[PDB]
């Protein structure tokens, strides 16, 4: 068959890479059609900012999505397009795999790390308001429920993808109630399965134990109370933001796949972006979609390109245009 | 001549403290110490013990402290005796010095980077009240008055220590009101010292950049959102909680500690702990006292006993005890007189 999937181009280097990754699928003739649905910040009737109805009905029709990064204003406008986007689809899990690129060497070797971070609670969704002049209060809440829901996802991921350890990153020293709960929910599901080996490290220790040696970490699970400073840290071991993919897995197989790399204003429209992010993002799509062999073809293509070294893009150590990159990878796939 | 309030605390902490005072003995450093032997794991603790601490801080106005060990099985952290102390001194402005040491190779060598974070609110104001059957709520506060404070301190530290750039790591994107305010203040104070480059970085991105290349930075000022993490992440570039000094300042005080102070910072036993953090923080304390001569000596000694490679503790790749590594330093301190 020939499946279809929503596509949000995104803002900035959205078009550059979304065009690039569209064309590797095209070149590779994968059974995907793209239903482009520009989702922009659109005001709400009651002031509760809704979604472009175009993308809201379009995604329910495909239950799948690849998306470029959206733009959030520095202090002047929409709360964020991504937060609202993840929440109004209950994509309760932001899986950030993080593995090396064999041919592209960093100071870190053989790093296979996965951040499973919860995606619909904590600082994602809350009031922040002006209580008096010059004093701001913020009201981030965490639940008992989704705590359990991500800590089940943790062991389920580590169960499908054959993982040794699952370690709960938490800050129960400085937030007794909030993250003391989460452990309790982790602890409960971790007893359910001695299948997977478990522990609990505090967040500051991990970030230190991490830049020292990412050989001690398999899967990580986190409440969205400390956002994903860990996930972007780990994206410094691999290579760059240009090479890390990311996944808003949700229930019922709905998922939006994007990359950590954001709006990228500096190199907007300059044609020096990295398509490796949105690409390996879409290689999660297929491997999530069951299209395993369009996956390993495209994926292993992008690696062998990188290893050869003659076309790797600007942030990877070579003056090579995002376009010329995307066709060395295109040509590479076809035979 | 020069009294310094010394708080050993608990952990391997009291051992390091010893090492600092023994090395001061070797160098003959006209600093005499009042130890306050305050701790909750050993139950030498009350607020009457804290008061005696601050009665000490009124006079000497300058103190070197360890980490007091909160018992997380009953209390938390914002009610630790360590937070309760930090409070009484109106400490703000944590100063962490991320500087690699020549002869301790890491993945981040020749690095020179100082991490200013606000130490009074943000995560440390966490108000937590349960609202439902199982809905926890977390209330956090940001104030223009505590931020205009952290950036004037930051800039005044940039000028005072020769440093030319100052970055403001901020989360304006989603925290549009808390860290919008923080940026507004930072931008405000940022014109006032126009001999200093200023720039803003979203925090998310910065922890990636902090490990993809820390060499792009110099002075980092940030609100206390997210906690003491980034101090600890950077402090790994330079070889760990065994070596990265730290200091915490006040309007009127200066408390000299260690940069990276996670739980199980040094979960070593008898001996077998590194004292480079304490010692490099002692000399920095000494510089504060304008004993620059004795600050030079201690500092330049232990930056070289670890360059020469003969003695090395567990964490730096070596076999020696702490007694052995501190006694190596005395020998090279005693030499440096003549
Ligand atoms: N997924 C999302 O929704 C995200 C959205 N954003 C938003 O977009 C804007 C982005 O801000 P920043 O963090 O400064 O941008 P960013 O995180 O996208 O960083 C781009 C910068 O980092 C490097 N970079 C990142 N990705 C790259 C790539 N693919 N190719 C080449 N270089 C790359 C470049 O040096 C560039 O200057 C912000 O408004 C932010 O809120 C940021 C991150 C993620």
Author numbering:
A (entry chain A): 3 to 337
B (entry chain B): 14 to 351
Question: Any passages from the paper?
Answer:
The α and β subunits form a heterodimer (αβ), and the α and γ subunits form another heterodimer (αγ), which are assembled into a heterotetramer (α2βγ) and further into a heterooctamer (the heterotetramer and heterooctamer are also called holoenzyme).
In this structure, there is clear electron density for an NADH but no electron density for Ca2+ or α-KG at the active site. Unlike the αMg+NADHγNADH structure, in the αNADHβ structure, NADH binds only to the active site and occupies the spatial position of NAD. The αNADHβ structure is almost identical to the αNADβ structure (superposition of the two structures yields an RMSD of 0.5 Å for about 610 Cα atoms). The NADH binding induces almost identical conformational changes of the large domain of the α subunit as the NAD binding, and the NADH retains almost identical interactions with the surrounding residues as the NAD. In the αNADβ and αNADHβ structures, most residues of the α and β subunits, including the β2-α2 and β3-α3 loops of the β subunit, are well-defined except a few residues at the N and C termini of the α and β subunits. On the other hand, the inactive overall conformation of the αNADβ and αNADHβ structures could be attributed to the NAD binding–induced conformational change at the active site and a newly established hydrogen-bonding network, which stabilize the side chain of Tyr-126A and the β5A-β6A loop in the inactive conformations and further trigger the conformational changes of the heterodimer interface and the pseudo-allosteric site.
